[PDB]
Amino acid sequence: XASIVKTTIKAXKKLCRGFXLXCGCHFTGKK
């Protein structure tokens, strides 16, 4: 191998990883 800085995309980790969108949830999303 790895050269000089692979960058590392900032943000998109704090609950915004897209994975688990209303999967482990059974809240009141109903009338």
Swiss-Prot record:
Keywords: Antibiotic, Antimicrobial, Bacteriocin, D-amino acid, Lantibiotic, Thioether bond
Modified residues (2,3-didehydrobutyrine): 7-8, 28
Coiled coil: none
Keyword Transmembrane helix: no
Record PTM D-lactate, positions in chain: 1
One GO term of the biological process aspect: killing of cells of another organism
Keyword Kinase recorded: no
Residues joined by cross-link Lanthionine (Ser-Cys): 12-16
Taxonomy, superkingdom: Bacteria
Modified how: Maturation of this lantibiotic involves the enzymatic conversion of Thr, and Ser into dehydrated AA by ElxB and the formation of thioether bonds with cysteine by the cyclase ElxC. The next steps are cleavage of the leader peptide by ElxP and membrane translocation by ElxT. The leader peptide may be removed before membrane translocation, in contrast to other lantibiotics for which the cleavage occur after translocation. This is suggested by the probable cytoplasmic localization of the serine protease ElxP that cleaves the leader peptide.
Record cross-link Beta-methyllanthionine (Thr-Cys), residues: 20-23, 22-25
Function recorded in the entry: Lanthionine-containing peptide antibiotic (lantibiotic) active on Gram-positive bacteria such as staphylococci, enterococci and streptococci. The bactericidal activity of lantibiotics is based on depolarization of energized bacterial cytoplasmic membranes, initiated by the formation of aqueous transmembrane pores.
Protein's name according to its UniProt entry: Lantibiotic epilancin 15X
